[PDB]
Each structure stands twice: as structure tokens, then as C-alpha cells.
Amino acid sequence: AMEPVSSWGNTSLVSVDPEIHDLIEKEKRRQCRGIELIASENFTSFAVIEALGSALTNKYSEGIPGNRYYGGNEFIDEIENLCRSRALEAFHCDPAAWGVNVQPYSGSPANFAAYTALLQPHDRIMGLDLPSGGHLTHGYYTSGGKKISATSIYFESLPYKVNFTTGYIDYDKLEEKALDFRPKLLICGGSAYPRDWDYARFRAIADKVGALLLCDMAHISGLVAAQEAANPFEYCDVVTTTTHKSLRGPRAGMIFYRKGPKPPKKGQPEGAVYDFEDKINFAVFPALQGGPHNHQIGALAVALKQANTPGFKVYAKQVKANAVALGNYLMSKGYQIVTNGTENHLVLWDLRPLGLTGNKVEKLCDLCSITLNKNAVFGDSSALAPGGVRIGAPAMTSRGLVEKDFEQIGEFLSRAVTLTLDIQKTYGKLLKDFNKGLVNNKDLDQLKADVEKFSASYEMPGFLMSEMKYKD
Amino acid sequence: SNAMEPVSSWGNTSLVSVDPEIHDLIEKEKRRQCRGIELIASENFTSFAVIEALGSALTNKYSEGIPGNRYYGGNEFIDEIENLCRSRALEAFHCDPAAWGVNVQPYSGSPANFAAYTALLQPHDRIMGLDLPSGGHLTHGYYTSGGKKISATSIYFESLPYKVNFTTGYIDYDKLEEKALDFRPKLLICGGSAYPRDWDYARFRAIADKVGALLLCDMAHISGLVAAQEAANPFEYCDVVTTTTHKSLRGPRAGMIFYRKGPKPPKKGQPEGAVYDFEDKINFAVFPALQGGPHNHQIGALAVALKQANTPGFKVYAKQVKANAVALGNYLMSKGYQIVTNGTENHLVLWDLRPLGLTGNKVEKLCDLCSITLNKNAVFGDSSALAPGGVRIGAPAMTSRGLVEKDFEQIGEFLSRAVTLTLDIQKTYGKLLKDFNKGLVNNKDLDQLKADVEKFSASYEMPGFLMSEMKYK
Amino acid sequence: AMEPVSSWGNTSLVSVDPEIHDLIEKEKRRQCRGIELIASENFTSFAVIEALGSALTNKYSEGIPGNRYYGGNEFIDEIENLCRSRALEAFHCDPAAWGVNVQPYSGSPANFAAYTALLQPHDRIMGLDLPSGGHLTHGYYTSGGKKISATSIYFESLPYKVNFTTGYIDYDKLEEKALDFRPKLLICGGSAYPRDWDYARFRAIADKVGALLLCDMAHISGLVAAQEAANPFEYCDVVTTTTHKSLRGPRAGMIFYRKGPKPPKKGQPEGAVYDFEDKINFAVFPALQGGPHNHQIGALAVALKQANTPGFKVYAKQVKANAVALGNYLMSKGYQIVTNGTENHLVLWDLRPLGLTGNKVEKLCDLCSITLNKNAVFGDSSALAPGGVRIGAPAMTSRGLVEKDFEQIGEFLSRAVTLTLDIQKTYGKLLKDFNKGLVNNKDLDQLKADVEKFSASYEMPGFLMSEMKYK
Amino acid sequence: AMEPVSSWGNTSLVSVDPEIHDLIEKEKRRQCRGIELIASENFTSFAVIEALGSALTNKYSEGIPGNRYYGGNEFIDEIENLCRSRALEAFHCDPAAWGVNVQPYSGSPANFAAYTALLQPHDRIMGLDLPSGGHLTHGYYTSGGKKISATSIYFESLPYKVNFTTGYIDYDKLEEKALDFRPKLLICGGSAYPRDWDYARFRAIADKVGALLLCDMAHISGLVAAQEAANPFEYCDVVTTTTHKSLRGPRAGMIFYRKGPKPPKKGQPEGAVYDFEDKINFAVFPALQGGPHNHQIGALAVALKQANTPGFKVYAKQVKANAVALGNYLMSKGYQIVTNGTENHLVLWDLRPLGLTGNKVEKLCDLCSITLNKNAVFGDSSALAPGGVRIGAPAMTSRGLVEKDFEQIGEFLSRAVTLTLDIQKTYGKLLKDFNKGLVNNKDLDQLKADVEKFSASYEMPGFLMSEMKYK
Ligand SMILES: CN(Cc1cnc2nc(N)nc(N)c2n1)c1ccc(C(=O)N[C@@H](CCC(=O)O)C(=O)O)cc1
Ligand SMILES: CN(Cc1cnc2nc(N)nc(N)c2n1)c1ccc(C(=O)N[C@@H](CCC(=O)O)C(=O)O)cc1
Ligand SMILES: Cc1ncc(COP(=O)(O)O)c(CN[C@@H](CO)C(=O)O)c1O
Ligand SMILES: Cc1ncc(COP(=O)(O)O)c(CN[C@@H](CO)C(=O)O)c1O
Ligand SMILES: Cc1ncc(COP(=O)(O)O)c(CN[C@@H](CO)C(=O)O)c1O
Ligand SMILES: Cc1ncc(COP(=O)(O)O)c(CN[C@@H](CO)C(=O)O)c1O
């Protein structure tokens, strides 16, 4: 005799699985009691989450709208059609010149599918070097020749770097390297670069060496949509992105691609038109993915509707203004940030002049409910000892914080780095001894409690703090 | 301007007010799911509790790495959730954690397989899997007669399929053995998407050992049956087991990669005390090689599903799923229809339409119009992709709504009426699709069939949400 | 002061390097005092050798005739043009429908340049399996997965086999495999298959799977020229060959390719023409080789004139008659030759029914001045101890031997195998045991003396036995 | 009824193939009636040519000495062993620390074999850029992405360049690129570079990036053997070469490789030993080649003996002294050479200050019997046409010319570029117009005549001018 449907299938999580329910409630408390500075994180809306947790998860819908492998997709099709056109609308794309696939599971799936569509195995790729602020998915291999990214396993990658004096992209060295290496794909976009991108110059380089030009705008997609960042669609053939960072949506990826007539070309036929659409669609499916995750797609459609509002543009401006205010506060205390400013959502803090390592700061901060991450500095490609931390404004800005609140965050960070110096002063620059100061430290306990009282006092999108299990 | 919208406005308001359009479409899709007869073998209806974990604050957290070795901080509770997910995974599948580990981060099934391949093979290494017209899946490799590489498994690796016996419809182990002796795959893959019989993993191991291949089972379709001990256990013979979690296992949409650990079994010419080293390679392929941040809301939801799957009640359901497939299969054979291998031992029925003079897509498109959802499926010999010769029918989703054998025989009668209407249209308008499409318009028997079907479907419970609360009643 | 030009540069080899001169004189004696049965070996002519050793070795001539990177190639061009046109004439090709590149240094370079011209790295290739009579350059990899041939390193090979019962190529199994595997290149030809090739059935299979069809005719190239073997040019897109085997020329390779209008197809523009010429030329140079070896090409031109004579056709007939006579003799003594006969220049002999492996017979033969080589047979997996030996007729036929002489060769071979059996019976199959019988063996000594006395009575092309150092 | 062996097999070339015989006599005359300045060409000895044109061509000998696949190799082994040990001797290698494979058919086969032995497909390689003086086989792809060398087809290559101002290899740019690219194999050596190489710095660079270090010493093979150039063996893991350039032997290649204990390196186990020998042998055969060309190997053993003499060392000194006397002659006349001198066998002439291209000069020089080749200068690749020519001394030095003769060659080159400019004044730079001056030009007639009388006044190794057909 089967267990009735209402029992296993309709009972709430709290009764079905108190263990997981309790863990989610502890994670809910952690999120609204911490100062969350990881540049790639955000707090998405309850409306997004309600679509994310929905019966859309049940449906297999392989194919694309209007061309499915099987049936039952009448409404899945409307949702995905709406998600795609809301995506082109959010990024101000003429749909006769731009298409988009919203099925990639995440950002790395979106990048690898773009590479699969446009390149053969072992074709050459160039992206921003990791210690210059690039991302793993743009290619990464070690000095010992170990290939870390699958981008470097199945293709041939070579990084370009920032100028080590200024911290800006050395466009001359990029152009020199691309002319020698002759990449078939040139990637722009990054993860820890604190300035905006000159896509026009990337298009000029791309045209000189004959490469396709792809922008991965994942970190700044929210800024791009809000027209608070330079527009990569003006110059790139293909644009990839995540949807969960500054865009403030679910965890998913998108691939945008040109359609229609190609611009004037050196000796190639009149009337030539782009042929990305079919290649990109086929790489996503059937080549790489299986059934799309329709709960992410519907949730993304909600996110994209929310992004295309006057309010979201205000949020994007505030994100930048908050990043700037935090950076100015740290520089006024004597700290040094990379390029002495920011033009986007993040700040790169150089910790070498303090004699501290990104590891120690990240460790201490985490024990004080401040989450950031360590990060290489000024392109210093050496080892496992990052000399900086990366700080981002999207998540706390989403909780309603403005400049003076981010100045308070700067003062919290100042107390943390002061605490870190003092712990290194007493126990030394070796981590296993530094750790002894991290336990039963009343000063740390005081800072952590002041951090949590600060964070507790702001609203939280996505759920109701008044209803959460752990308010204390 | 320069003042942000209040958090309560954009961030806490419910979906029905924030996005009436999307809310309305999800409610239409909710009604569709509980008013049709859902026979797509890879689908299921998961619990509300799984869905509550899936739509949760876990979506906000970046946690690259694994429990106990993250890149970032703040992962105290994500670590407890993922560790719980792994150990419930090993429990549900009866693995000794000293001999088996599991990575639960794959985004879906195809990511799980490509990660397993990346972990164990170099680019262009040889792979063999079950041919699609024999019941296999794309992710095990697929290229066309023209030489077109369809699956990324065939783009980045060198695949060669194996087939069922031309006559019996069972895996042809001798031909398999012969091909692998010649082709010499580095990885031999078992499991499939439309094969109606259980698998002999002991024979696959013998062949794998004979040729020197790693043996991997993709148990996606039968995951719930294996966990329930209602199917042969691949963990007893395979090096690596991959799976989805949203099919018969009835979880969220995700993948898992199981791998052996510890001392290797005695093989000749093998150094004594030899140990498996799948664990580091598989973890590394998932991250940092292939994926980015894990989707923690899926992982937490998977943990819920793995708890639910490891119950006595879930074993009853798996037994019923197999009993419902058989009941439907016997019902269709007793009407004169041709079922592949004349029965089933798992969750699905493979129906051969070629003796009827019918193509799988015709029956698929007519059923869809009557709220019967299935899929056309290649049967042995097929060459087409738009127009294969059969349909594949599964029991898990309608069984999860509480249907038993008698209800599945009513489904069989609905399937008979639909095929008869399909032949009626063909007899009247022609065998060409453009002719055929004329019968699907203003068709009274088709309207009648669609009404009976939804009347039927409406009579059962629905997991995952409350019908008593839906927009469309 | 510099050594005068005449001193180092015009003095004979006997004075400049007596050590090497003496070694070549010892090798000249070996060649006319032994029974030479290596099926890939021949005795080329003095004329070929006078061109091979000439001032042509001095000239760099990268490019093709009329399109060289360097100047001064007026006469290299005429020679290479002469060689190409004589190549087409020898194999009966209309130059409007076939072209040829004569620059490959040897056979293996010819094959790799053909693959490089026609395929991308990792494309699929099918070739005759080695234990079915195939060659390494058509692909070889071990059961353990060791990639042995470059063909298997840079491309993806899968072998096709002979039918177990008949010893003939199994065209049904081939078609089945090619349909599954989907090769882009299907290769025919071999080095130990004793029968001829049905190129029409191969073309039917290649069309069925969408493969290019290449024939490697190296072994039977002299028989093809003479129209004593089926003609691969009737059905193949590309034909590769060596020139030093049955063609009786210098050591070189050639790549023949179709030109001009294509036959009717589908998706092919009406009026389409073959596109092999430029890819093949380019793959040979600049992709793979450097400067051509012009002395080889001039010597090859001479050989190609000598092959296109009525005399060469008599030789090719005799080569085939001698092989049949040898195989018939061995079969009458109870020996198992594969397919129980031959249609070409060689005989393949399964020794496993005798309880022997081919390395034992090859070693004992060698000590008796009989040169052949061990050879895999159907089912073998051993590098060092295959189950057969391969024997071919071109070289000793070139010395004038006819059927009667090859029946005596059979009796020597039968004597050699009986002695191998005696030794094995007495000492064992273990190598260090079998060796115990290879020394102080009076029966061995006698067989060697008989063999060399038989061998010295016949003429020898390439040099004058009357003027050689060791008689 | 076979044709008698003596008619086809022992008759001389002149009566068997008068066409080919005549063309070789024309090419013999051409070789001594002009000024051969192709840096990669030489005139080898009659002794080498006699071994090259010998009965060694008849033998199949797959394998290596003492480890052959079949029989008849008693004297082939002695010859190949002698070639290998003379090779190690000529380049001053301790045989406990160095081995050599002498079977590569030429230089490009040697290089591709070395790569196959040392690297997996698609592994990264760096070599000297072609416009910077490198060679195709070290990698070459076009600005469009077309892969030209098989090196770039089957591996991933990235070139390094000379300094565009000074013409010297930019070693700091190379280190920068190697650190970014991380090649598994770093190649040194080139085809048109007028300076010696800093192998110690290449070793420092290879060790910094974890690369293998190979030298392709083809052009300077003779200078290194004669100890007239830096020794790559002190620093490189592998040395490949041809044998027909400054080494003055037959056309063939060699691969040297280290053996025995490795020197200390951090991260290296104590007692670690080199593992090149089996890999390199296996790549050559059975992976890439078939039968060795034993006539080349025999001819090579001769050339290696001739190279390890006091006479040959005087020749290598004279080669460098002649290249220096030519370079200092041109600089004395206002002309400019890259790096303003040379340390080896060649000069690189910058023609751009004259407003000339290397194409105009190479073609006018051919029309009056001076063979040189156009060449890019200062690593320029954007240039429509090459801005210089390359001139080598080994070939005419082998004819006995000393410094004063190469000064006379300098005057002939001055006349050539003057007469080239004469034509450019009166027809411009468009080659369709420039071609108009290359016909019915009396001044070019006088130059062709003076050059031909000049060349005829010297001896010729390899054959006897007194006995040639065309005098
Ligand atoms: C991904 N896949 C499986 C598959 C399954 N269901 C589908 N369903 C639909 N509606 N469309 C598909 N492309 C489809 N494809 C494919 C894709 C292409 C071919 C294909 O090329 N078929 C050729 C035959 C192969 C050839 O001639 O090269 C044909 O004629 O249909 C087959 C299967
Ligand atoms: C190239 N080739 C054919 C071949 C023919 N004649 C030869 N002759 C000699 N003297 N040596 C050889 N290696 C040799 N090889 C080879 C090479 C390697 C193997 C091999 O690697 N291994 C096994 C077979 C074991 C396996 O199936 O992998 C052996 O012992 O022969 C087989 C054949
Ligand atoms: C054996 C096997 N392995 C892997 C997958 C991939 O699952 P995914 O869609 O989550 O990527 C599938 C999907 N199978 C689905 C979609 O093709 C089906 O309807 O059969 C599968 O059958
Ligand atoms: C530019 C870019 N492209 C792609 C990705 C991958 O997104 P995914 O986690 O969804 O795979 C990232 C993630 N970036 C995260 C994790 O590394 C970060 O903290 O910076 C990215 O920055
Ligand atoms: C360094 C190097 N390595 C290899 C080779 C090729 O030798 P090969 O022609 O015997 O193949 C050359 C030939 N170089 C000739 C033809 O390009 C030349 O005129 O320079 C070379 O310079
Ligand atoms: C069909 C075929 N194609 C190519 C080759 C290679 O010729 P090569 O030695 O000149 O490389 C051979 C060599 N065959 C020789 C050496 O293995 C033999 O004894 O059979 C061949 O048989």
C-alpha cells in the first residue's frame, strides 16, 4: 500500500526534513547578520525565489521554443519566449540584430557552450589573466604546465595582463600578444578588475588579428543593463553572463549573439550575414546540456522584469557610488587600493603595505561575520599567497545601504585589519601560530557582535526576518 | 530620483504581485501537470518539501570548492548541508563510505557525465555506449551517418556505440565484446534511456576487464529503482556511477557522481596495496575544471529527496512503478500491439509503431493534443530523428500521483483510442504529415478524447503543490 | 693550407675510406651468395645506381617544377618532369585525369603526406590489420593501447580483417565496421596478403560510408605496372607506392591523385573538379619534407623507363609463376601456406601447425644465408614471436631464376625448417635453449654451403661480379 | 623468356637512359659554371657519391644494429655502427653521455621524429621565427591562421624574433614569451642568422620554464664539428641536423640525444638518468619511417670520416674567413649587412637602403649565373617582399676559393646590384616593368660571361670537369 500523496508529497519541508530546514534557517540568519562583501554575491528577491521553487522543476522540455523534441510545452514555451525577449529588452538589443539562449545552467556552462559553438577543439583563446582580474573559465594553466580550466584542456589559451604600474589593461601588450598568438577568440570581461572596459579598442584588436570578440559581462551585467557601464553589445560578436551577481537574479547563464547582416568586411561577400544563432543553440543542446531547468528560466524572467525598471537603475548607480565611497574611505585611512579607485561594483585592496596576507584578513573577517575573499594584486602571478582582498557592493546595497553605511563598513574593515595586525604582532607571520589569536579573542568577539548588530538593523530581500526561526 | 526602491517593495513582495505574467503561466503549467496523463519516462512529480528547499535563500551563496576545502568563507552551514547530501546519497544507494564517495555538485545529468569523462579520460580517448536506436542516450556519444558530431561526448572524445541484438532486443554482449576488443575503449558505459530490461553489470565488468576499460554506469533513469533495491545494483561491479536525481529518484534537477575509493580488487600485474584514485580527479573535474559555484538550493533539495528515497514507503512506490509499467505493457500487448522485448523489467514501456504503419511523431503529436504526453523514440533500425518508429512510455510520474495497476490499464485504453484516432486520420487524409495535420483540426473524437483524459487525470492527488489553492480549477 | 680539392673531393672511395669500401664489398658478396627472399627487397639495375650516385645530390630544389623557391633549377625541373610523366605512363594514367608527386623520400613519408593532405588530425582511418597481412603505416595499436604507428598517434585507426576460414579479406565484416566506425579514409593494399584486391568492392564500401579510398600498392607496384595485378587506379582517389620493391627501382615514394572533372554525386556542384593536387603537393612540401632528394628522382626516372618495357612484363609474369611454384612445392611437403596459394609475388607460411614460431625459422635461415622475415598470421599478437614467415620472389627472379630454381629454394626452406624442428626437439622452445643448437651444427654448416653454392651460379644486376673484391 | 640480366641490369646509364644521362651532364655543367651562394648548398666528395650510388640501396634493415626485425644485416650493422660512432667522434661526444640515430631520411624527417619522440600531439613548441632567420620545421603559421608546417599542424608553435633594430636574437623577449606560453620544447638554431648562439642562455631559459632544449644545427653542422662555433652539446638535450650543408655529406639527418646520469636540478631525484634513447629510436622506427636508406648511411659514414680531419677544420676556418671577407667587402662599398658582420658561414645583406627588394636581386643574379636567395631582414614579416638576400660561403669554399676570390665575388655582386638599380631607374619598381630590362640587356650579358669564366677557373669535387660531357 503506497504512502498517500498528501503525506510525502504535500507536507511542508519543516515537517518532512527538520534537519535541512534547520540548516536553511541557520543560513538565513547568517545572511542577514553578516556584512556580505563577496563581489559575486547578491540577495535576490522573494518573487524570483517563488518562481525558482515551483512546479516548473518537473518538466522536461529539450529543444527550443517552437522546435521541441516532445510535447506538453505550451506554457514552458511562453515562459522561455518571455524570458528571452525580456533579456534582449533589459540589454537594449534590437531582436533583429541580437538573439539569446537562456538555457545555460550557470556561467561556466554558458562560457563552455559559447566556446564549443564558435571553435574547434584546440583552437586558440585569449582572456584576462587570473592575477590581473580574469576568471578561470577564460583559460588557466600553472607555471608547471598544469591545465586547471577545462577551457585550457580542450582549447589552447594564453592570458593577457594588466600593466603592473597602473593596474589598467595594457592594451598595447594585448595587441602585441594577439598578433603573435593569433587567437580565434578574444575574451574580454573579468572578475576582479576595478575599471570599465574599452570594447572599441578590443574590437580594433579583434579586427587586426582576425579573432571573434566575446564579452563575459557576468560581474557587471546589472550595471550594463542599467546603462551604468560601457555597452559590450556595441562591439562584441557574443556576450555571455551570469544572472545571479549584479543582475540580482537566480543562478543561471545566458548567451547573447549577433544576427543579421555583417558590417563591411575586408574582401568578403556583400550580403553576408551572421551565423552564430544555430551554432550557439546546438552547442547548448543537444551537444552539451540536457533538459533545461525551467524553474531557473521562469525565475530569470522575473529577475529580468525587475532589472528593467527605473528602480534598478537607481540601485546600479547606488552600487557604484557605494563602491566608490568604500574605496575613498579606505584610502583616507592610508590603505592602498588598486588603481586608486573604482569605476564599478568592486574594490581591490592591496594588503602588502600592511605586512598582511589576504588569507589572514579573509580568515579574521569571516570569524567576525564579514565575508570577502582574498585576491591577487597588481598582476602578481606567483603562488598561493594572495596579497589582497576583493570587496564588492552589490549584496549590501541590495539591503538598502548607501554611502554612509558603506563608510561604516570601511570602519569595520579598519578595525578588522587593525585586529589582524595585532594578532600577527603577538604570534607572528606563520598561519598555524596566527590561528592561536583567533580563538577566545574578546576583541574579535566584540567586533563580531558589533558587525552583527549593524547587519541585523537592515531589511533583507527574499524572506521575512520577522518569520525566521533564529532571530537572536 | 537617486533613492532606491524599498526592500519590502521589490524584495519581499510575492511573485503574484511582482510578475503577474509569470505567475499566471506557472499556474497554467500547474493545472496542465495535474490534468494530463504524463507518460514521459524521464519525468516525475517531486515533493513540496523538495520544492521548498529549492526555492530558498541557499541560492544566494557562493561556495566554490568542497566541504572542508572552500575558496571563500561563510560556508559553515553550506558545508553541513552538502555533507548531509553526500552521506544521504551513499546511504540511499547502500555504499560503504570507506569504499565509495560522491560529488553532488553537477548541475544536471549531462554535466555529471561530461565531468566524469573529463576526470577519467584525456581528450580524444575512446568511449563506447549504448546506441540511441538501441535505447542509449546522447551523452554517451552520438554521431550521424554523415559524420556529424552531435553529442559533445563525440566532439571531445572518440565514441563508438554498441547495440541490442537484432532479434531479441537485448544487449548483444558478444558483439559488444567483439567491438571493444577491436576498438579498445578507455571507458565502457552502461545504462540507457529507453532500454526496457535490466542490465548485467557482471558481464559488463568481465568485458571491461577483458579489454582494459573503466566501467561506468549512468543509472539516471532507474536511480529510484536501484535505491529501492528494485533493480540490479551497478555499484557492485562499476568503477563510477553517474545519475540524475529528478527522474525515478523523484528529486530536484541535479547530477551526482559516485566513485570507488580505497583498495583495488586483485588484478594480475597490479602492484600490491593499490588504491583507487578516482576521488581527486572527479572532484577536480567538477571544480575547478568545468563548473563554477555549486547550486546550493539544488543540493539542499537533493538532500531532502535522498532522505525521502531511503524509506520503506519509497520502496513500495518503486515496486508499484514497475508493476504499473508491466500492467500497461500487458494491456497494450493484449490489444495486439508490439512492445519491445515483449515486456519490461523497469519503469518504462517501449512501443513499436512500425507494424501499424505509423510514425512515432504522429502519435506523439496527437497525444499532446489530447493531454497525453509521451515522446517518440527510436526503435531498432531507425535512421530518422524527426520521425522515428516508436514511442516510449514511463510509469513514475502518474504512479507518484497514486495510480495503481487498474488506473494504468485505463491509461492503456486511452493510448489505444489515441492510436486508433491516429490511424483514422491517416486513413482519411494520407500518410504524409502535411496531409495528416488536417485531421488534427476541428476533430470531434479528438475533442472527446481530450475531455475524457482530463476528467480522468483530475481524479487523483498531486504532489508538490495544493490543487485546492491553484489559480485554475 | 687547405687540403686540395682533388685530394678530398675527387679521390675514389677505395682510397678515401677503405673501411667503408670493404664493408660494401662484403655486402655485395652477401647479396649474390645468399637466397634473398625478403618480399620487399629487389636488386635494382646499374643504370638506376649510376643516377642515384650523382651530382644531383648537390641541388636544393624546394617547390615543384616551374614553381621553385630558389633559382638554378632548369635541369632539376626537366628531370622531375620526366620522372612524373614516366610515372603516369608506367601505370597507364591519362595525365588529364591523374597527377603524381615523386618527391616522398620513401613509402612511409608518402603515406603520411597523403594522410596530412587529406585529413585533419584525429580523423578516422581504416586499414588492413597486421595479422591479416597489413602494414604498420596503415595504423597499428596494441591490445594494451600502445600507439605504435605514427598513423595511430596522429589519427584514429581501426583495422579490418581477413575472414578466418578463407584467408581472404572479409568484405562483409569490413562494410559492417566502416558503417559503425565511419572512417574518413579507407586504405587498401598490404604487405603479406597473398591475393589480389577487389578495388570495385572497396569503392562500393567507401561510397556507402562517405570515405576517401586510398590504395597503397607498394608491394605489387611492379605487377600493377605490368598489368599482372588488378588496377587500383580504376577505383581509388589516391594511390601511394614505394619504388624499390617489385617496381625494381630506387628507394623512394610516390603519391598519385585524380585530377579533372568529378563523377556525379550529390551536393556537388555540376562541373566540380577534384582538389587533390594542391593539397598533396602542399603536404609534401612545405608541410612535411624539405628539399627533394634529386638523385633519387633521377634514378627513379630511369627505373620508370625500365619498368615500361615488354621485358619488365615478362619479369612480372615470371615473379608470379615463381611464387606459385614455390608455394606449390611447400604445400606438397605438407606445409600450410595461407589461402593455400598465391596470386602475387609472395607466399605467406603458417608455422604454428609445425609447433614453430617465425623468429626461430628466420634466425636459422639467416645463419644459412637464407634471408626472409618472420610475419604475423591470423590471430597473432606477438612482436617477437609471430606464427609465420613471409617469402617473396622479386629479388631472386631478378637474378634470372625460374620455376625449377624456386622448387630448389623450397627444398632448402624445407631443409631449414626440419633443422629448426630438430634443434627445438633436442633443446626446447626457450630462446636460450633453442640457441644451443645454432652453434657447432654440422647440418647447419652443410646447408649454408649448399645454399651459397646454389646462389653464386646466377647473374647479378647492379654491379659486376667479375670486378668485386670478394669472390 | 626473360630478358638477360646483363642487358637491363648491368648496362650503364648512358646507353640505358640517354635522356636522364644527358640532363645530369647538363646539371654537372651548371654546377661549375656559376657562383653558388645558397647557404644551404655544398659540393660533396666523389667518395661520398660512390657510397651513395651502391648496392646498399637493395637492403631492407628495419630496426637498429643488433636489434633488427630480420636477417641479412651482418654488414649493414657494421656500417651503421661505424656511422654512429664516427658521428659521435666528429662532434666530440662521450658515447656514455650521448647517442645518435642516423636513420632520418633528411632534416625535416629528423626534426619531426624528434618532436614525435619528445612530445604528445598539440604540445607547445617555440622556435626562431622564419622572418627572423628560423626554419619552417620549427613552426610556421600565417597571419591568416593557415598552418604551414606540419610542426604547426600537429603541435602548437609560437615563434621568437630577432631585435628589429640590431638583428640579434632578443633573448629577453624570448624569456618573456616562454614564461607566458610555457613550451614543452624550446628549439634553437636557424637558417638565415649570421651570429653564433648563446646556448647557456637558452638553457637558463629552458630550465626557468621547464622546457626541453633542442638545437637544430643543420646549417652550422660543419662549423660545430670543426670546433669553429659554439657547441650546442654542452647545453641541449637533443641536437638534430642535416648532413648535406656545411658538413658536406649526403642528404640525410641525424638525431643526437643525451644518455646516462642527469646533472643536478632542483626537484630531480638523485641518480635520475636520461630517457631519450628509446623514445627517439621508436619515433624514427617503427613510428614514422620504414626501411633505412643504407646507401645514405654508408655515404654518411664517409662524410663523417672526412669531417673529422685536420683538413676539414682548415676548411671550416676558411668558410668563416670567406664569409667575413665578403661581408667586410660589401660594407667597404657602402652596402649594409645585418648585425654588421658575421660569425658563421653566411651574410645577410640589407637591400632596403638601396631601394631594392630581394626578389629583384635574386632574379637578376640567376640570369647571370649567381645563385642566392631573397630573405627577410631584421625579422620583418609585414614587408610585401623580402628586403634582403642570403649568401653562403660553404659551396664555393669547397671549390678552393680563399678570401681574395670572395672579394672578387663581392665585386660581381656589386655589379649585379648596380645593374639591378640601372634597370629600376629606367623601368621603375613594378616587376611587370622591371621584367622588361631582363631581356636583350648587353650589360647583363657581360656579367653572365665574366661570372662563367670566373667559375670555370676552379676545380670541382664530386666529379671530373675534364671528363664531363659539356665543356
Ligand atoms: C540530437 N539528435 C537526436 C534527436 C532526437 N529527437 C529529436 N527531435 C526533434 N524534433 N528534432 C531533433 N533534431 C531531434 N534529434 C539528432 C540530431 C540530428 C540527427 C540527424 O542528423 N539525422 C539525419 C540522419 C543522419 C545523416 O544523414 O547524417 C536525418 O535524416 O534525420 C539525428 C539525431
Ligand atoms: C611493431 N610491432 C610489430 C613488430 C614486428 N617485428 C618486430 N621485430 C622485432 N625484433 N621487434 C619488434 N618490436 C617487432 N615488432 C609491434 C610492436 C610492439 C608490440 C608490443 O608492444 N607488445 C606485445 C604484445 C602484448 C600486447 O597485446 O600489447 C609483444 O610482446 O609482442 C607488438 C608488435
Ligand atoms: C541515461 C541518461 N543520462 C543522462 C541524462 C541527462 O539528464 P539531464 O537532462 O539532466 O542533463 C539523461 C536524460 N534523459 C532524458 C532527456 O534526454 C530522457 O527523456 O530520457 C539520460 O536518460
Ligand atoms: C566573469 C565570470 N564568468 C563566469 C563565472 C562563473 O559563474 P558560475 O559560478 O555560475 O559558473 C564567474 C564567477 N565568478 C565567481 C566565482 O569565481 C566570483 O566570485 O568571482 C565569473 O566571475
Ligand atoms: C635549420 C634547418 N633544419 C632543417 C632543414 C631541412 O633539411 P632537409 O631539406 O633535408 O629536410 C633546413 C633546410 N634549409 C634549407 C631549405 O629550407 C635552406 O636553404 O636553409 C634547415 O635550414
Ligand atoms: C604496403 C607498404 N607501404 C609502405 C611501406 C613503407 O615503405 P618504406 O620502407 O620506404 O617506408 C611498406 C614497407 N614494407 C616493407 C618494410 O616494412 C616490408 O618488408 O613489407 C609497405 O609494405
Short mmCIF file of C-alpha atoms in Angstrom, two decimals, chain C residues 185 282 446 453:
data_model
loop_
_atom_site.label_atom_id
_atom_site.label_comp_id
_atom_site.label_asym_id
_atom_site.label_seq_id
_atom_site.Cartn_x
_atom_site.Cartn_y
_atom_site.Cartn_z
CA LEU C 185 39.91 7.43 -45.20
CA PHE C 282 51.49 21.21 -50.19
CA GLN C 446 76.33 -28.09 -44.81
CA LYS C 453 76.97 -22.66 -53.97
#
